[PDB]
Amino acid sequence: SHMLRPVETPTREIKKLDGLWAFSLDRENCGIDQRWWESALQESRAIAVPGSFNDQFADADIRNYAGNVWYQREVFIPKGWAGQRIVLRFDAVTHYGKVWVNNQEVMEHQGGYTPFEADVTPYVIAGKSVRITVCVNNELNWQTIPPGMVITDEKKKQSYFHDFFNYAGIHRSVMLYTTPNTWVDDITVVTHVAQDCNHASVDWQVVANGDVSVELRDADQQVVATGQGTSGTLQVVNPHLWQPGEGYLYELCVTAKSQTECDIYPLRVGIRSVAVKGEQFLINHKPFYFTGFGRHEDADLRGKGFDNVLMVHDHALMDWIGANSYRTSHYPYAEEMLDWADEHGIVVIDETAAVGFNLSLGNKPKELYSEEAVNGETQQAHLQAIKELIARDKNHPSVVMWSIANEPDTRPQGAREYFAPLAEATRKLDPTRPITCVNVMFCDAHTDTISDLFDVLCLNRYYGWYVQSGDLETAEKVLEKELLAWQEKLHQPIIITEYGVDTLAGLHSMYTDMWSEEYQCAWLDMYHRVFDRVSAVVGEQVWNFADFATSQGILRVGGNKKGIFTRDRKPKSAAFLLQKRWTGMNFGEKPQ
């Protein structure tokens, strides 16, 4: 469970395994039987790690593959790591990985978007080359997060219920890292902030197999507070709060000392509180207004693979357009993104991979919550996905809210019985952040059965698109009516976590009609006018930052075209509309 982000210290080294690996499909599904991990993969080819495997090859038969694929490389253990605790770590393997070091099985993970690792000290020798084999499986069933159904025809075909392509592979960094045989295994900080903002407290809890001391250092490396033992509270006079748009960070240096060994782990800490009060979202006791995007991890060639240039360029576009926030739609993002948000003061709604709990979007069993679909084991798997997300992200000050799912069908019998325990367990795992369950349009104010269990109303709305098609005048009436009915029903802060229309870049129309750039601008504008008239709306996240790949079908013109930007990051007209609205408002303040 304990999952600290590897960082280089006087007591910790890292060796990235990113680069070219050997790669092989297993159409006969005989690689486990033939123990492929005991040899060089036969009939293999070069693949980039990190990256989705699907689009690296310009090959439809690989892109559409369902089953196991195999990655392998050789790596030299640094000579100096003799006597040291050596960990092998995968930041993310989509959706399942099993790992062998030479002929030793070392670890296994279900969940495509959070890290897994094993201590491999006993199975490697410092100064020698070792063989790493990974069996990666991209199949979804009713107990995976997200769910799906594999149909077999004779040949496997993956069915799934979410509007983004089922990219798979080693999407994020692989690495070896070291600790001493005494080490800091875990840290929780809780950051309290007086109402007047003129004092703050920092609770710590540490797990380590040796005596623990902590030093809190400011941005200038001046020690502002010190403590001892596994737990306690640091007092901070006149603290530099972590504020949206700035993101001042302290460093909590955790030392675990044995008589013989010592370990130093620096954790970035942003001093901020988050709370809902009535229909206001407060950060450091001040109302905040969310602007920005639903995103995806999606790009040409690399699929959902992490990439620094893309992270730099996309943050430069969000900065320029005046976005203050985003949501990790619809899975945990690369941790680098949360390190970025921490440092630049970007506000994040951190979401699990639990999209698709919904059989009514655009074969399938009769009852959504039943033994044959979302069941007891599904709910366990969902709890595990929430635990892994919070265990990874609990200390990121940029994360202001947990979204435990996107667009579940809450009409059917058993929805509330499924969600209640998940809402409760989320609050116990992290009491410091509000929780949400992002709401599908047809589960309206008069229909939805679970919104009372959550703190903030995150509504996905597309009136004037899938319904009242091309009619802004009717869409505006229906939208305003529904937001006010939500305000009346629950008196929670409302974030519109999804509003957008498919827009084909370069399609221009004097009739302002669907798919045109001019429609995208008129439709976003109508939404904005309505949001500004409703006092409960504390945010707006446009769907989507950029055009992204989907499953093939008649609704998707080479993918999802709701982007503000093209997949190659070129702006549509609507990017300039958002630039003016979001840079023209006062930072973090509801427009008028």
Q: Which tokens belong to 4?
A: 């600290």
**Among the options 388, 476, 498, 540, which is catalytic?**
498
Of 231 and 552, CB closest to a second copy: 552
315 vs 358: CA distance, rounded Å: 32
Q: Find the shortest distance in angstroms from Cβ 561 to ligand 8I4.
A: 9
Q: Nearer to ligand 8I4 by C-beta: 314 or 502?
A: 502
Is 68 labelled as part of a ligand binding site?
no
Let me know if 181 is exposed, middle or buried by CB neighbors in 10 A (0-12, 13-18, 19+).
Answer: middle
Dump the DSSP string for 215-284: EEE-TT--EEEEEESSEEEEEEES-----TTT---EEEEEEEE-SS-EEEEEEEE----EEEETTEEEET
Q: Is 498 a catalytic residue?
A: yes
Select from 161, 465, 531, 548 the one that contacts a second copy (CB under 8 A).
465
Q: Give yes or no for a contact between 6 and 89, defined as CB atoms under 8 angstroms apart.
A: yes
In angstroms, what is the minimal distance from the CB of 507 to a second copy?
5
- The interface region with a second copy, picked from 89-97, 186-194, 315-323, 550-558 by CB under 8 A, is 550-558
Q: State the binding string over 146-165 for a second copy (x if CB under 8 A, else -).
A: -------x------------
Which two structure tokens, joined as six digits, stand for 216?
């809190």
Question: Strand, coil or helix: what is 574?
Answer: helix
Show Cβ contacts of residue 74 under 8 Å, excluding neighbours closer than 6 positions. 129, 130, 131, 132
Which CB, 61 or 196, lies closer to a second copy? Answer: 61
* Minimum distance, C-beta of residue 58 to a second copy, in the bound complex (Å): 4
Q: Which two tokens stand for residue 35?
A: 């123990």
Q: Please give the Cα distance from 459 to 461 (Å, whole number).
A: 6
Identify whether the C-beta of residue 24 lies closer than 8 Å to the C-beta of residue 43: yes
Q: Which is nearer to a second copy, 410 or 560 (CB)?
A: 560
Residue 343 among the catalytic residues = no
Contact flag: residue 298 with a second copy (CB under 8 A): no
Alpha-carbon span 384 to 391, nearest angstrom? 10
Q: Considering the complex, what minimum distance in angstroms separates the CB of residue 235 from ligand 8I4? A: 43
Query: Which sign, positive or negative, has the C-alpha torsion 34, 37, 39, 43?
Result: positive
Q: Is 562 annotated as a binding residue?
A: yes
Residue 406, annotated as binding a ligand: yes
Name the minimum Å distance from CB 551 to a second copy. Answer: 8
H/E stretch holding 83: none
Report in angstroms the alpha-carbon separations of 238 from 193, 201, 235, 241: 10, 11, 10, 9
Segment interacting with a second copy, rule: CB under 8 A, options 141-149, 246-254, 383-391, 549-557: 549-557
Cβ-based nearer residue to ligand 8I4, 433 or 561: 561
Tokens representing 573 are 């007209």
Q: Which of residues 551-590 bind a second copy (CB under 8 A)?
A: 552-558
Residue 465, annotated as binding a ligand: no
Closest C-alpha to 303, from 111, 163, 166: 166
Nearest distance, CB of residue 313 and a second copy, angstroms? 24
Question: Going residue by residue from 466 to 505, which x/- string records binding to a second copy, judged by CB under 8 A?
Answer: x--xx---x---------------------------x-x-
Q: Which of a second copy, ligand 8I4, none interacts with 245 (beta carbon under 5 to 8 A by kind)?
A: none
Q: How far is the CB of 522 from a second copy (least distance, A)?
A: 10
Q: Write each residue from 59 to 98 as x if it is in contact with a second copy (CB under 8 A), else as -, in one continuous string.
A: xx--x-----------------------------------
Breaks in the chain after residues (C–N exceeding 2.5 Å): 154, 362
Element (H, E) at 560: none
498 has binding-site annotation: yes
- Is the bond preceding 396 in cis, omega lying within 30 degrees of 0? no
With CB cut-offs between 5 and 8 Å by kind, which of a second copy, ligand 8I4, none does residue 558 bind? a second copy
| Nearest alpha carbon to residue 334 among 425, 272, 396 | 396
Residues numbered 362-421 forming contacts with a second copy, rule: CB under 8 A: none
Residues that bind ligand 8I4 (CB under 6 A): 163, 330, 406-407, 460, 498, 543, 560, 562
As annotated, the binding site for D-glucuronate includes: 163, 406, 460, 466, 498, 543, 562
Which chain residues interact with a second copy by CB under 8 A? 58-60, 63, 153, 465-466, 469-470, 474, 502, 504, 507, 509-516, 552-558
Which residues are identified as catalytic?
A: 407, 498
